[PDB]
Amino acid sequence: KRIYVSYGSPVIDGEVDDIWNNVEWNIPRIYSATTQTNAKFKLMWDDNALYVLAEVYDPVLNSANSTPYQQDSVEIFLDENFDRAISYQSDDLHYRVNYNNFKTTDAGDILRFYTKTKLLPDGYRVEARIALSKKPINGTIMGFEFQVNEADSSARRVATINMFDNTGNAWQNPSLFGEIKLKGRSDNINP
């Protein structure tokens, strides 16, 4: 399916910009197994960047596991040119940030990836910016997929939560991502 992204430039703090409450939550519904952990996320775009605000309900937080994806984290995947390739292309991006704000990259240049995270009672918040290389304009479509790695007190990932891909191959296969179409940028203060 296709998510529609409104135009806007939020401030990366791990605080909720006023302008975030004007767009909608997205619910990832693909669970690997049954779990307490739930999530919701919002999207925005501006002339330079893609913006993501995520909130995870998760009562037990762990990142003792030295495997990045085996920590309470979230992963974002991007197909910028919208190649819907079978394997990762030169413009394909795959990053991850744990609750502590520790960033790791599976695909693409991590210098593009700017993140802050806040602890909440029984969860955390992630606010990320991704520098765009292509000039985003209304109607632009890209590949996008979102995932929540849920670990337990054993320091191991027990469950995943996915927005688009239920197969578990998002980390291999760009074509498994979903759609984001950008809209809402102007064509054109009085004190």
Ligand SMILES: OC[C@H]1O[C@@H](O)[C@H](O)[C@@H](O)[C@@H]1O
């Ligand atoms: O390190 C690559 C990892 O990427 C993640 O997207 C997947 O959930 C893991 O199963 C995979 O091993």
Ligand SMILES: [Ca+2]
């Ligand atoms: Ca903010």
Ligand SMILES: [Ca+2]
């Ligand atoms: Ca957990």
Ligand SMILES: [Ca+2]
């Ligand atoms: Ca691509």
